């Protein structure tokens, strides 16, 4: 808006949150989650189970902040009420890829990718757990309460598996994200 | 215009200047890093070069042509008479670097160290540590100073000296060295360990072990004033040159109108 741009969202009943100097804390039945936003100039207010974010004098790129901050807050809410689940698919043609979970779901080891000799180890970020799908055959499941940590872990795995110095249109192998959701 | 063919410079510019060493002997600039929790141990020793010889050994080196046969190797012998510990010094890590806290000397000091403190022992008046040895007769002062070190230091070193009377050398004064103590779980353990071997001999058998690797620090052989061909390894000039042929033909371009420090010149070698 010409004088100030603002946007509002709803606070669900199962969730309780506190605000202070742009530090938003959300508590739910899945755990607690905290984020910091003091890197932007914002006015956050809490009134009758609604969060509203306003920026005064929206000039230039300041007009893009309220909506992104609202999206971050809603992601926090949906994480605390019930977490995220990313599913990965192992794609291979000749040499099966062998993946083993170690450290009580806090890490994974990948061996025999393209029949290579070296092995790969990736560590899940704090609050991220990794396990193999019982129903589906060649699947990876990672769950957590923060959408940032799990997607970061999935990107880490995908980048860890990479074929060097060939035609990538023909050599298709590695772990790919096939689904993002909640449950 | 550009030099027609490719070639590298001659010599390493990281060893400049090539001047006579002004340090009395080889000194240990850095000590091995200290890792907490490892067994407490000493890190260095001082000895004298004696000779070289042969050895025949058996090589078990999987993947090489030598894997199951004999080899003749060159070896060097170093004479290592026992060292005597005689002082403790502690340092504190500070924003300005490593700063000493205090140094505590033993009650009694051997003749070689005293000799190290003078230039001519026979004529020199014997006053070094004369007041200190009266104060430190009882253990109280040593205990107080060690308590200070325990409460204020981060790095612990001992001071040991050699015994030239056990060597064929003509020297009678000793060499004094600082040796770091590595390992343990805290500074108190280090201080107690260092105090447990004061005024006592230390054998090289308790410092190094067979099969490990070491660094050696010394001063190379001297040669005096030497020319560029031998000092820097530049090419000799052809036979027809007037005024000799052991030199560098061109020592610079017209501009810059100075001589650069990267050009080879004659001077001290070794």
């Amino acid at each position: 808006m010409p004088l100030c741009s603002s946007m509002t969202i709803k606070v669900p009943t199962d969730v309780e949150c506190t605000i202070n100097k742009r530090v938003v804390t959300v508590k739910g039945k899945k755990g607690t989650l905290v984020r910091d936003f003091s890197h932007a100039p914002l006015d956050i207010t809490h009134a009758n189970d609604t969060i509203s974010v306003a920026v005064w004098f929206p000039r230039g790129k300041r007009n893009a902040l309220p909506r992104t901050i609202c999206s971050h807050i809603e992601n926090m809410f949906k994480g605390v009420t019930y977490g995220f689940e990313y599913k990965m698919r192992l794609a291979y043609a000749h040499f099966p890829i062998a993946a083993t979970v170690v450290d009580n779901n806090k890490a994974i080891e990948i061996r025999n990718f393209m029949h290579q000799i070296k092995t790969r180890r990736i560590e899940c970020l704090p609050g991220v757990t990794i396990a193999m799908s019982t129903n589906v055959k060649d699947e990876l499941i990672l769950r957590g309460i923060s959408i940032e940590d799990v997607s970061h872990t999935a990107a880490r795995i995908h980048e860890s598996l990479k074929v060097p110095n060939k035609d990538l249109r023909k050599f298709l192998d590695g772990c790919y994200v096939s689904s993002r959701g909640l449950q | 215009s550009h030099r027609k063919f490719s070639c590298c410079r001659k010599g390493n510019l990281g060893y400049l200047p090539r001047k006579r060493c002004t340090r009395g002997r080889g000194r240990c600039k850095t000590f091995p890093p200290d890792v907490q929790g490892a067994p407490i141990h000493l890190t260095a020793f001082l000895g004298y070069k004696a000779g070289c010889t042969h050895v025949m050994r058996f090589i078990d080196h999987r993947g090489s042509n030598l894997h199951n046969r004999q080899a003749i190797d060159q070896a060097t012998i170093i004479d290592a008479p026992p060292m005597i510990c005689t002082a403790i010094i502690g340092y504190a890590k500070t924003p300005k670097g490593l700063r000493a806290v205090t140094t505590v000397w033993a009650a009694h000091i051997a003749e070689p160290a005293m000799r190290r403190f003078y230039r001519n022992y026979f004529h020199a008046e014997k006053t070094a540590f004369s007041t200190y040895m009266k104060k430190a007769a009882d253990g109280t002062y040593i205990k107080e100073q060690l308590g200070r070190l325990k409460q204020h230091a981060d790095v612990i070193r001992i001071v040991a000296h050699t015994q030239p009377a056990l060597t064929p050398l003509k020297q009678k004064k000793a060499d004094i060295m600082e040796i770091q103590v590595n390992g343990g779980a805290s500074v108190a353990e280090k201080v107690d360990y260092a105090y447990a071997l004061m005024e006592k001999p230390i054998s090289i058998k308790d410092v190094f072990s067979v099969g490990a690797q070491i660094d050696t620090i010394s001063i190379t052989r001297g040669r005096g004033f030497e020319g560029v061909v031998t000092r820097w390894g530049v090419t000799r000039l052809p036979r027809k040159t007037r005024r000799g042929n052991r030199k560098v033909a061109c020592i610079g371009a017209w501009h810059p109108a100075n001589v650069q420090y990267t050009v080879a010149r004659a001077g001290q070698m070794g």
């Binding site: 794609a91 291979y92 990538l168 249109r169 023909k170 298709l172 192998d173 590695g174 790919y176 096939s178 | -």
Partner: protein, 50 residues
């Protein structure tokens, strides 16, 4: 590979746009190169083993 698996891989490795200026990878319905800001975009060529 199952055909569904090949579909998953290809959407990560085949479907994009290429800038004729700097050769950068761009999203599938972008109008400006993310790097040079130019507009002369292309389509990543399909492999013969379609």
């Amino acid at each position: 590979m199952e055909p569904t698996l090949i579909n998953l891989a290809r959407e990560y490795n085949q479907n994009m746009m290429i800038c004729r200026h700097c050769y950068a990878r761009n999203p599938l319905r972008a109008t400006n190169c993310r790097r040079c800001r130019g507009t002369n975009l292309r389509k990543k060529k399909l492999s013969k083993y379609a």
